[PDB]
Amino acid sequence: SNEDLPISMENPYKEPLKKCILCGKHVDYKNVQLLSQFVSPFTGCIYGRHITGLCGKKQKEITKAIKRAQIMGFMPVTYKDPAYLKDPKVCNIRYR
Amino acid sequence: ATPSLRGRLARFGNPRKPVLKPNKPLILANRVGERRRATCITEMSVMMACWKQN
Amino acid sequence: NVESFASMLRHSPLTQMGPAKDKLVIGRIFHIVENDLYIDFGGKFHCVCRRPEVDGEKYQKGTRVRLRLLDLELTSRFLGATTDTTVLEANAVLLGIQE
Amino acid sequence: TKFSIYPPIPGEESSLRWAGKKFEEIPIAHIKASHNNTQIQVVSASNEPLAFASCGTEGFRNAKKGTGIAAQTAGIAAAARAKQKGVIHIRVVVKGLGPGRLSAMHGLIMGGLEVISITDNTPIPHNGCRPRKARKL
Amino acid sequence: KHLKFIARTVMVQEGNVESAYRTLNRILTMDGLIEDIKHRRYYEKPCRRRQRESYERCRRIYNMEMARKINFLMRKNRADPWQGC
Amino acid sequence: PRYELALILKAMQRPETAATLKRTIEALMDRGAIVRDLENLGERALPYRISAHSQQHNRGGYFLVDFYAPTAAVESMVEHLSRDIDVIRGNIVKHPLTQELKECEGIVPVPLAEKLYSTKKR
RNA sequence: AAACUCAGUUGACACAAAAUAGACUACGAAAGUGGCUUUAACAUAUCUGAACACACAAUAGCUAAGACCCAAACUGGGAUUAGAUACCCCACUAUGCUUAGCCCUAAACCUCAACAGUUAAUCAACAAAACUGCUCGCCAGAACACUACGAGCCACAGCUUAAAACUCAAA
Ligand code: FES
Ligand SMILES: [Mg+2]
Ligand SMILES: [Mg+2]
Ligand SMILES: [Mg+2]
Ligand SMILES: [Mg+2]
Ligand SMILES: [Mg+2]
Ligand SMILES: [Mg+2]
C-alpha cells in the first residue's frame, strides 16, 4: 500500500514505571531501622502512603511488619526509636 | 495524587458495596467558597494585676 | 509524482521530535505584553513566558529564543469533566536568546 | 550546631546543660489541662513533689476555672511556690486540651521559671474504655 | 511502659516557648492526635463514624481536585493579551 | 513447615544464657522441631518495660531460632516458652523467607474515574 | 446545681476495646470483618433454581453460669420548664463481654435479583446513563393491615404467612 503508513506497535517512548523505593526489597519485622524510617518521630504513628510514597503492597507490608515488631518487642509503639532519628529521611513530611 | 474514585461509588457493574456515599455529586463547581471570617489580653491581665497590688 | 500525506507527516520535523518532554526547541517571540512574551515554537499552541529579569530588555518581537518544552498543549481532565480542559498554550521553559 | 528540636538521648554524651544539670536531671512540670479545670504540679528528677496549683486553689469558681486567665494565675502560683524550692529550669509535660493548656505555661513563666522542653502527654487510648455517649443540645 | 520525655517532646529553642508550643501543636495536628482526642471525648457511634469518614473522604477528593484545577488555571490569570477585541 | 522463633531472653551471664538456649532448643527437638540455625541479635534495651513472671525487664538478649517443626508442635512450643521463666518473651512466626518477592513492576497510575455520573445537562 | 473528698507524680496491674496504617477498597453468600502469632480454611461449575426443605442471619431480647474497666435503657437525685414522665449534670442496674442453648427481627438499603451480552441507534422527572437475551422471586388503587382468624415455630406482650367487612376518590 504505502511504506509510510503507521505500523501497529507499543509506545517505544513509554517511560519505565517509578518503582517504589522498597520495590524488590524484603521488608522484615526485624529490620527495626527500616520500619522506624516510616513512623512519626514524635508519636510513632505509621505514615500514610501519600507521605511514604510506597506502593500499596509495600505499604501494607510495612504496616504489618511495624505491628509485628511493636507487639513482639522489637520496636517502640509511641515514638520512633531515638537511635534511628538521623537515618535517611524518605517520608515527605515537614513539621517545622 | 487524588484518592482513587474507581469502584468507590455505588454503580451498576460494581460488585463491591459502596465505599463512598457522597450526599452531593462529585463534580467540580464553577466557583469557590467565600473567605470565612482576643488580643491584648495578656497586657490587660498585667495592668489589672498592677491595679490589684496598688 | 506527489508525496503522500503520510510521507510528509512521517518526515516532518515535529514528527522527528519524539515526546516533547524536556526537548529543546527554537521559539519566536510573536507578541509581548509588559512582562509576558508569547513565544511560538512551531507547535499548534504558543507558550507564555515571563520576561527574564536578566537582559529582559533584550527580548523583543521576533527575537529568536531557546525553550525547553514540557508539554505541547496544557490540558487535563477534572473531577466530573467529560472532556479535558485545555488552556490552549504550551508549557515551556525559557532558557534565553539564540544567536 | 544548629538547633535540634529532639530531646537529648537518655544515657548519652549530651553537651546541653542548664545550670550544669542534665536534661534527665531538670525537674518536671506536670500540667493537666482538663476541660473545666487546670492543675499544675512541679516534681523533681526523682518525682519528689515541689509545688502544686490549680484554678480552684487560686480561687476561681465553677465556669471561671476553665479559662486562660485562671490557668495563668495557677501557673504563676505554682512558679512562685517552686521558686522557693529552688526550681529554675523545668520540662513541661502537659496533658489535656483544656483552655488553660498554654496559659498554664505562660503563667508558669511569668512566675519566673524557665522552660526547656514541652512534652504533650494527653492520654490517647489506642482503643479502650468506651467514652460517654454524645451530647445532643 | 515507655521511656518518658521522648514522645511528643519538643525542646524550646532559646526560650521562645510560644514558637515551641506552636511547633508541637503543628506536629500533633499533622499526626491527627488533636482531632482524635476531640472526637474521642464523646463516643462516636460506628454508623456516625462511617458517615463522617465517607464525608471527609469525599471532601478531600473534591478539595484536592479543585486545588489541582486552580493551580492548573493559575497561569491563565495573566493580563489579557488581546485587549480591544 | 518452616518457622522462626524470635526470642527475648533475660539479660544474664554467658553460662545462664547458654543453658537457657540449650534448654529451649532441646525442648524444640523433643517436640519434633529440626533446628536449622541460631542467630544472636545481641543484648539491647527493650523498646518498652516488659514484665514477665512478675519480674520487670528493661534489657534483653534477642535471638532467632530458624527451624522446621510439625504444625501441631507450635502450640506446645508456645506453651513451654510461656512457662519458662528465663524467657522474657517469645513468638513463633512463619519464616519470612518462605514468602516470595512476587514482581511488582511499579506504581501503575490510576486514571481519574470516568462515567461516574450521567451526562445530563443542568 | 446536685455529687465525691478526694486530686497530681511514680510503680505494679484485665476475662473490657482494638490509635496511626486507612487518601488503602480487600475478605465473606449475607449479617459482618481493620491489635499480634499459629493451626484448620475461604463450595462447584465454564448457567438459573426453595415458607417446598437444610444451614446462616447486625443490634436488641430470653434461660443458666461467670466477668465487670468503661458505657448504659430503667430508677433516683440536680437543674430546666407553665408542666419536662425529655433534651443538660451526677450515681447506678439490666445490658454491652465469655461459655451453652434459644430468639430469627433491621432504613437486614448499594431500597437497583442471578447469569450472559451491547453501547448501537438514548432517555417521563429525580436518582447511580440506556438497553438486549434468559430464569426465578414479587406487585395489580388508598386505608383497614408489620392487623383479625387459621397454621408452624425452644418463640407465651413474639416471629413468619396474612385476609375480609365498613369508608374514600383519591392515595
Ligand atoms: S512499586 Fe513495585 S513493589 Fe511498590
Ligand atoms: Mg444455583
Ligand atoms: Mg431463598
Ligand atoms: Mg441473630
Ligand atoms: Mg453490669
Ligand atoms: Mg416487624
Ligand atoms: Mg402478627
Ligand SMILES: [Mg+2]
Ligand atoms: Mg394467631
